[PDB]
């Protein structure tokens with residue numbers, strides 16, 4: 027990994043985000059990428075501003091310069107695909123900020139854990155290719171063989187953590203260089219546990235573990251913190267349906283295209299194509315999003331808000347209103 031240049035930092039530092047509250051739950055990132063001919067430089071600046079305005083980096087001896095080196099090292103390792111690009115992880119970073127500060131989840135974690143979560147947001151899909159874990163295993167691709175031989179089914183998640191550790195071994199981009207001993211260890215262990223928990227094959231088990239811990243006054247405090255961090259990164263990662271309908275609708279179009287491309291390759295590759303990755307099935311977005319709301323996101327957000335995160339009620343309100351707007355699209 028080559029170092030970040032004065033050219034690159036300036037490219038970001040000069041962006042001034044006019045009429046945009048990055049801390050707000052309605053902050054639009056799609057309209058912020060259409061307000062400049064350098065959407066990447068804008069995104070980095072959102073991430074930068076988010077990270078400084080928390081007041082966390084400074085407390086953990088992470089300079090403004092290191093922090094921006096880190097963000098730009100991250101952005102370099104994301105790809106030009108429809109969904110799992112840099113815009114996605116900046117989205118997850120900004121959304122996690124709102125759950126922590128507008129939803130008051132910060133009250134449940136240490137400053138270090140809040141710092142770790144905002145950082146983990148940016149590393150959590152590094153060098154994603156627009157193909158799910160399943161694709162790599164069904165095609166017996168090298169990464170799939172390595173994961174299967176290695177004994178770990180989370181193909182992509184382990185890849186993401188490998189690159190994250192790369193970026194942070196170089197002090198010029200190590201946002202944790204200011205930590206030592208237990209704190210430094212916790213920052214790495216929790217960043218990795220969180221990324222590994224983003225695998226949706228573990229979705230049910232991560233959710234049931236967090237709810238069992240929240241209902242237990244005698245849960246180990248360390249383990250409750252860890253499961254809260256994991257649930258918050260998971261929350262961020264399926265937060266598309268908690269946003270204003272047009273923002274949510276845009277995210278779904280990008281993710282439907284990414285699914286479709288995989289299913290185009292799975293066909294020429296001659297492997298099993300599921301209904302949702304098949305273009306010629308031309309399934310209605312309305313029904314997709316209603317399906318996703320009903321089976322994954324509504325139950326998830328309802329249960330964590332009831333269990334523990336009462337401050338995040340608005341997510342359940344917006345999911346409810348977004349669903350009703352899709353039902354209206356159907357009814358007409």
Ligand SMILES: COc1ccc(C2=NN(C(C)C)C(=O)[C@@H]3CC=CC[C@H]23)cc1C#CC(=O)NCCc1ccccc1F
Pocket residue numbers: 224226263264266267277278281282302311313314315317318321322
């Ligand atoms: C804005 O929307 C979405 C954001 C995220 C995802 C994900 N889904 N998943 C897994 C649940 C299959 C992943 O692993 C992805 C990778 C990591 C985290 C979450 C990601 C799906 C969507 C959607 C949608 C849509 O319109 N119809 C898709 C088909 C569908 C229909 C009914 C129920 C579920 C379902 F996926």
Ligand SMILES: [Mg+2]
Pocket residue numbers: 150151182224
């Ligand atoms: Mg992922």
Ligand SMILES: [Zn+2]
Pocket residue numbers: 114118150151224263
């Ligand atoms: Zn993600």
